Nucleic acid binder design. Structure first.
Lengths: 80, 73
DNA sequence: CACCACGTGGT
DNA sequence: ACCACGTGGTG
C-alpha cells in the first residue's frame, strides 16, 4: 500500500505493537488448545511450561501405550 | 538493595524464558511433523496439538479392534 | 520463586 | 513472520 509507506511514525509504532498483540493472542490461543488436547490438564490452570512439558510426557505415554496395543492385536490375530 | 532487587527479578525471568525455550525444543522433537523442519513457536504448538489428537484417535480405534477381536475370539 | 503480558528493538 | 528482553504486577 501506498499509504503504508508514507504513514507517520505514530502510525508505524501503533502498528508494530498491534501486530505483536495479535501474535501473542495466537500463541495464547494455541496454548489453550494444546492444554485441552492433553487429558492430564484437560481444562484447568497449568502454566505454559507445564503444558509444553506434560504434552511431551503424554506423547511418550501414548507411544508406550500404542506399542502395547499393537502387540495384543498381533497376538489376538494369532489366536484368531 | 532496590537496584540489586531488580537484577534478580530479571535474572529469574530469563530463567523462565529458558525453561520454555527448552521445553519447546523437546516438544518439537517429539512430534514427527516438526522433525527436521524450521518451525515458529505457533507452528510447534499447532502441529503438536494436531498430533496429540491424531494419537488419541488412533489409539481409541486400536482399542476397538482389540475389543472386537476379543468379542470375535 | 513461580506466573504473565506488554512495549520495543532487532533481524 | 518471529523472537527475546526488561518491566511491573500477582500468588
Amino acid at each position: 500500500n501506498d499509504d503504508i509507506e508514507v504513514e507517520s511514525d505514530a502510525d508505524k509504532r501503533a502498528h508494530h505493537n498491534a501486530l505483536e498483540r495479535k501474535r501473542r493472542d495466537h500463541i495464547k490461543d494455541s496454548f489453550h488448545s494444546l492444554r485441552d488436547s492433553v487429558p492430564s490438564l484437560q481444562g484447568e490452570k497449568a502454566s505454559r511450561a507445564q503444558i509444553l512439558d506434560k504434552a511431551t510426557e503424554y506423547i511418550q505415554y501414548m507411544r508406550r501405550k500404542n506399542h502395547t496395543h499393537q502387540q495384543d492385536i498381533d497376538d489376538l490375530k494369532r489366536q484368531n
